[PDB]
Design a protein around this ligand. Sequence first.
Ligand SMILES: [Mn+2]
Ligand SMILES: [Mn+2]
Ligand SMILES: [Mn+2]
Length: 391
Amino acid sequence: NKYKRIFLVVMDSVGIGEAPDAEQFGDLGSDTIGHIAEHMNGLQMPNMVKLGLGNIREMKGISKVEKPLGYYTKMQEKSIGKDTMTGHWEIMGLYIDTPFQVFPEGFPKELLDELEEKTGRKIIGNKPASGTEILDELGQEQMETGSLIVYTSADSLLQIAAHEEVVPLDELYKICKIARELTLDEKYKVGRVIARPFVGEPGNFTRTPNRHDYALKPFGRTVMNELKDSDYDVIAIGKISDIYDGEGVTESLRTKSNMDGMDKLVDTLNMDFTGLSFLNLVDFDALFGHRRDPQGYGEALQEYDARLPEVFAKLKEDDLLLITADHGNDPIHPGTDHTREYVPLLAYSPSMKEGGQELPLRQTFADIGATVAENFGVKMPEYGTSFLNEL
Ligand SMILES: [Mn+2]
Ligand SMILES: [Mn+2]
Ligand SMILES: [Mn+2]
């Protein structure tokens, strides 16, 4: 192995400008990092800049350096979706040609009729809601009738709530497996079905820990699967294990915040593993992009950048650090959805004694997966082209 350890960091949603196909996704004008930098009157990410961020693209406060520490370029998404699952699946060697559906006016009647027919229970609600709100609204009716509450969010989710005394947990889990099968159809294709059992009574309903999730498996064997199969470590930090439905994961390190995720990254630098340590930093997307909060996004980016020196100091000569994103989510764009953007790519090892250079633009995010696969001598993904031998 050329590198013993690869540390891969996805700054979730940290896009570096509208992609060539942004118009088809309603995303003309989008620029995540750029528009944050404008809002801040200069974004301050001095560690990312020394890696080469400004050499990718100069932005306010983000300037070129003569001798970047690592290699730098951007990557273009090939897959049809701009969601977190698609972007991550593509990073790890896949090509996804159907989108995950969302249902802002509720699920279509034909899907709900099928679910009612197969379960023998009637369905109520059928709208975007928070869990708390929909129980307050419909919990009593659900208890009294034995119906199922089906609700969704702005994300590709189908959630089914029922009182544990009224619909036994075993049946609720069977109902969700049925729903999971029905939602494999391309017209109804949802990212995750979630069992939402609750207890209590009107004015005091509680969602129980008996929640279970039925996520879609990645559409093919990933580079993570190949690493785990070949007896390497695959250390998933944060939402990574969920995004891949555990496929190829050997250790899952749960996190509660971006700073907790950088702590866990450091924990893995301190571990004697051979393989991949893979971090998702989700707060960028969930708290700043989706909430259209550019000031918050800028502060969060600055906080993240201030953690990098500690990472740099613990990298060894045969370690490689890769920093990228999975899509954009421009916090001044209309609506609340992701934005179809190029993503940055920085590749740094302290063995780069001459500093890095510009890499050719990556035509698919799967170039990351292909590089990781070539490094560890595992079977090459069907999509992507390695840049291992250019480092
Ligand atoms: Mn848009
Ligand atoms: Mn994402
Ligand atoms: Mn999102």
